[PDB]
Amino acid sequence: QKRKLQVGDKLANRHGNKGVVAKILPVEDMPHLPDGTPVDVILNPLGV
């Protein structure tokens, strides 16, 4: 079957920053750049 990333999904970076996936806000109310093109993923700086 296909594994379409949902909620309980977890993903990390090549740098070792692992983390689950909480809510998946729609592109609608998603922080966007002054010229359209909204964001994709929001990481919390506190983990830096």
Residues that bind another protein (CB under 8 A): 3-14, 18, 20, 25-39, 41, 43
Q: How far is CA 27 from CA 5, 8, 31, 40, in A?
A: 16, 20, 8, 8
Whole-number Å distance between alpha carbons of 23 and 26: 9
**Shortest reach from residue 18's CB to another protein, in Å:** 8
Find the shortest distance in angstroms from Cβ 24 to another protein.
9
Q: How far is the CB of 37 from another protein (least distance, A)?
A: 6
